[PDB]
Design an enzyme around this catalytic site. Sequence first.
Site, PDB file in Angstrom:
ATOM      1  N   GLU A 140      -1.200   7.939  12.440  1.00 51.58           N
ATOM      2  CA  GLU A 140      -0.188   7.054  12.396  1.00 51.58           C
ATOM      3  C   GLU A 140       0.426   6.346  12.784  1.00 51.58           C
ATOM      4  O   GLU A 140       0.853   6.726  14.350  1.00 51.58           O
ATOM      5  N   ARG A 141       0.431   4.677  13.050  1.00 58.61           N
ATOM      6  CA  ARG A 141       1.342   4.523  14.200  1.00 58.61           C
ATOM      7  C   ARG A 141       2.786   4.607  14.174  1.00 58.61           C
ATOM      8  O   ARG A 141       2.984   4.489  13.135  1.00 58.61           O
ATOM      9  N   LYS A 166       0.364  -1.302  -0.428  1.00 58.51           N
ATOM     10  CA  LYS A 166      -0.519  -0.257   0.121  1.00 58.51           C
ATOM     11  C   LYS A 166       0.789   1.512  -0.681  1.00 58.51           C
ATOM     12  O   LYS A 166       0.452   1.986  -0.641  1.00 58.51           O
TER      13      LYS A 166
END
Lengths: 232, 469, 187, 91
Positions: A182-183, A156
């Site tokens: 976002e992680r 992705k």
Amino acid sequence: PITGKVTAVIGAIVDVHFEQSELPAILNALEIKTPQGKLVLEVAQHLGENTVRTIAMDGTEGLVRGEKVLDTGGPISVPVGRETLGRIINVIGEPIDERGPIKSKLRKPIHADPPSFAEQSTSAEILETGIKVVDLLAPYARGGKIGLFGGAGVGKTVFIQELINNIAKAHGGFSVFTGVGERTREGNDLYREMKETGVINLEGESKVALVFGQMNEPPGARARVALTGLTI
Amino acid sequence: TPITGKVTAVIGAIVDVHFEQSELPAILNALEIKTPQGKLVLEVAQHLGENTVRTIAMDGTEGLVRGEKVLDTGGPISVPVGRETLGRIINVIGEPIDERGPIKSKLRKPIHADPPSFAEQSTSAEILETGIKVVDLLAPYARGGKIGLFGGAGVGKTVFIQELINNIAKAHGGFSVFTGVGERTREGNDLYREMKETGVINLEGESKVALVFGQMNEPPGARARVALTGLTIAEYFRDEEGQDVLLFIDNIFRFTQAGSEVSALLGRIPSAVGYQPTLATDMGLLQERITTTKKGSVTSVQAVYVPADDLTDPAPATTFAHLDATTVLSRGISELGIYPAVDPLDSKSRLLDAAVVGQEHYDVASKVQETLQTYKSLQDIIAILGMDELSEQDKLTVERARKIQRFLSQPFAVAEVFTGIPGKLVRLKDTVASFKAVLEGKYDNIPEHAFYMVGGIEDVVAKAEKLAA
Amino acid sequence: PPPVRLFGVEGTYATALYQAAAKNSSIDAAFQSLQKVESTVKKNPKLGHLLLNPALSLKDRNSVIDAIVETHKNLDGYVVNLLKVLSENNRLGCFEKIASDFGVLNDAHNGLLKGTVTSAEPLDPKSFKRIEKALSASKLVGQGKSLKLENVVKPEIKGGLIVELGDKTVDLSISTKIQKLNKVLED
Amino acid sequence: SILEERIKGVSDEANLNETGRVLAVGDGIARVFGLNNIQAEELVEFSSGVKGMALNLEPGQVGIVLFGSDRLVKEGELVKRTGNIVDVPVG
């Protein structure tokens, strides 16, 4: 400028009582100098009686009721420029890439009014993309919204990277990868990958400008991260 | 009584007045604020003390200026009743909105009227046959009864009522009241035209029908007391004239709904789904002001717009409680194309009994119910695996039931335009016979399409011949 | 401890004023001076009516307070602290409300029984006197609190009389008797 | 007296009949003080430069509904009545 004393800290909702008659406008940005540098609070109501109600952009842990607040005077103004290309900036529009102060031309309020009916372009075009599959069966469109599906790590991220490469050929434009919640472990990897694939060349030029949202950031700052990116 | 006041608040159509004198109207008194829009009629609903009442406003409240002079009309709004009502369409206030000028008033009566007592009750036992096969077979009506319909409103619901008017009310004759709460204005105009055409209203002559119409454009508050107004007109016939009446109400969901809207504004803690806490009482009072006393028998027809067609919704649920017979009409059965779309496993009447309509009728009905319930039972199995994979014995049942389902459609003459099939009314005696034969499989040997959209058994036989060609 | 708590909202303010002035010892002085400034507030009609309604600042409110203590230099200091409280709570819309309540507490402290003899029409002075005598004679008067007899005219209360004082009333109005007679004669 | 004069001095003047001054504002509704004569569902124009339709006429306060972004309006601004129930040009 106007100054006010904190009169509540219920959650991340910090109420500030400001000196009479001269009160922030709705959507202004306030800065409380903190031992954490600064805390940016954004005025989202007037509670009346020369008090406002604000949301926070940095964690509210520790705060004496009565600390001085300073009103910047408007929605957070984030630097913009070709300088901001290849720079990770946090919600309060400051470098977190640690490549030091970002040289700025002009800075601009994060809230902005959408272009008028007149300013809308009256006919849509097709944005070219190197991927043949994309250009046949679901062509990208100029100024369109194209919604990705399929989990990260399938490539992705690589697909997103590909688009940057393509964009450089296609226009030679710029990009901004705005990451909402976002992680942060994943974010480090992404920065490293973007550096590695040279869409960000620290020495060289960078197409993409980075705005990374961390899940540890307050919900308010998670919400405003997108709008900040859009301003860029 | 001339009690000046000022308008303290105008929170929606729930104006609050503050009387300046210490004479204070009682609850359910009525007030007129005179404006260049004429009078606006408001009704006291709470006393909030300090000489400040809070009043429901039965007319639109746009343009009001706070502090505006009010004058108290005193007591509940008094409509005008008589036989002079017959041949009028009247507004909530009582204004003659069919513009036949001032109604010749005899007695003008308060909108709120206490429901007649336990002693005054007189129980019915009459058979009222509509000539609608599904009605006759499944749940016979009775004169004086409370008849009930459920489903999407004016999606065929309105048509059903129209068919009932077409059949029952010419035969019945005498006084009849049509009261339409929150109906589509154009549909109402159609009814008015149609009634005039079928002479029930003969404006040149006399009309044996009266009409009350409340449009759905009317403000929510206005819609709340459309119903109460109509009931008063009915009471004059029921009591004072003492001649059997008719009554039509469409939709009584609008009555409940209107209450729920005002309730929030009034300041009540919302009950489940959001309905007014006074839902049970208001519905109760209304439905006990519609009844058959020893003074008179009023056949009533009530139409319930079930929201989202969920019967479990508390407003439809509490409606189901106060009806004497119901014939719930289901969207699914509508999809099956059966008009009338009455669900056949969700109909009841206290008039379906083996005493009331005799053992032979009851036996006929019993078998229909059993057959259809079996057919419903095997719906899962039918879908998952073919009908050929059902037992042979069951396959006979399934084939019979498929026929019964098709048979149940009866073309309606009021729906003649829509169906494109000339309507047919089949006798009660004929209906029992027709189903009896089908149940014995006498005429089961001819296609399902033969039974589809046609009337009585004789018609089916003929329609087989038509198909056979 | 006040002479029986009454009034919650605004009356916690009144209670406080009472008990504070009990610790001042002079309650009567406080009340009298409050009465005088309250009266001149009412008899100030421009902005002493039209700025009894908050719409202006805390600072502006304070300066209104400052004008008020120029209007009387007799107001004790506890009722000047009461002015502070009301300005700080920015509630001026319950100043006369508090005044009335303080009056109730004060005259409870003074001990004066309150009453009214609502009737359809104003009664005879002989009737007033006889009733005053009767009420004092009755155990209702503790000899420690002396009735107020307030005639009210209420034709709606058709004839008769109703005596009221304490939580005890005797209602021998004509309206009630007619009401009951009619009601039972509808049975 | 001099006290009354000084009170008059600190008063903003006008009884705010047909004009108001905005109080607490946020969530696209504002609560305004004044507008003594106010038609119901009137169109009001704020000094902010936005117009709103009066929705809740309450004892002592009127609650305008802002036809427009909240950024425009700020507390204590003067609201003047358009004087007309909300109308739009037709023709």
